[PDB]
Amino acid sequence: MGPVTLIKDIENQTVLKDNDAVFEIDIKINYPEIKLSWYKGTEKLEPSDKFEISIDGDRHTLRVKNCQLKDQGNYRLVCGPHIASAKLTVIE
């Protein structure tokens, strides 16, 4: 059935300044050695004062907290053969 099974991909997001934003992917991982990773631009992301990263079943979540203007950019993920990118736009 392949290394992974995509159910629902991430999408571009628009967020009000100072609000939290969330990127959300549903993907089933069929091989135990395969892991998903998150990026902004080309830099790998980790849990921090700015980012929340979590896993619940097949649901992978990247939360960008307290979004300022400089938090805009391209947020990406890699998981086996699957890859994706989504833009964060900050308004108001």
Burial-class residue 70 by CB neighbours within 10 Å (0-12, 13-18, 19+): exposed
List alpha helices for the chain, DSSP H.
none
> Over the Cα atoms of the chain, what is R_g?
13
3-state helix, strand, coil in the chain (%, to 5): 5, 60, 40
Phi, psi values for residue 57, rounded to 5°: 65, -120
The span from the CA of 36 to the CA of 78, in Å, is 6
Residue 80: count of CB within 10 angstroms of its CB: 18
Technique employed here was X-ray
Answer whether 69's CB lies under 8 Å from 48's CB: no
CATH number, domain 1-92, options 2.60.40.10, 2.40.110.10, 3.30.70.920, 2.40.50.140? 2.60.40.10
- The continuous run of DSSP H or E covering 25 comes out as strand 21-29
Answer whether 24's CB lies under 8 Å from 50's CB: no
Provide the resolution (angstroms): 2.0
Q: Which two tokens stand for residue 26?
A: 């549903």
With H, G, I as helix, E, B as strand and everything else as coil, classify residue 70: helix
The span from the CA of 39 to the CA of 43, in Å, is 5
